[PDB]
C-alpha cells in the first residue's frame, strides 16, 4: 500500500549486517563481509484483513 525512503542510519545498517549474516549461511556468494549501505533504502508497509 505505502512505500517510503528511510534514512541510512544505524537502524538501516543493522538491516544490512543482518542480511549479509543470514546469507553467509546460504553463501550463494560465499563468505562476504558487510561494508555499508548506500541509498536509496526503501520500505514497504503491508496490510490485509482477508
Amino acid at each position: 500500500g505505502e512505500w517510503e525512503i528511510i534514512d541510512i542510519g544505524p537502524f538501516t545498517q543493522n538491516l544490512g549486517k543482518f542480511a549479509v549474516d543470514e546469507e553467509n549461511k546460504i553463501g550463494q556468494y560465499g563468505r562476504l563481509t558487510f561494508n555499508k549501505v548506500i541509498r536509496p533504502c526503501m520500505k514497504k508497509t503491508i496490510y490485509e484483513n482477508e
Partner: protein
Amino acid sequence: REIKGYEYQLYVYASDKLFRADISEDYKTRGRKLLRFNGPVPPP
C-alpha cells in the same frame, strides 16, 4: 486492525560488490527473514 508488517529493500555493498536484499519484518513480533538477495547489480 490492518497493518501486517514491513519490508526493506536495501542496497548493500559487501565484499566490495553491490548486492540487493529484501528483509521482511513482522509488525507484531518484530522478527524478520532475509527474503532475498541478489547481485552484483550496479549502483542505483
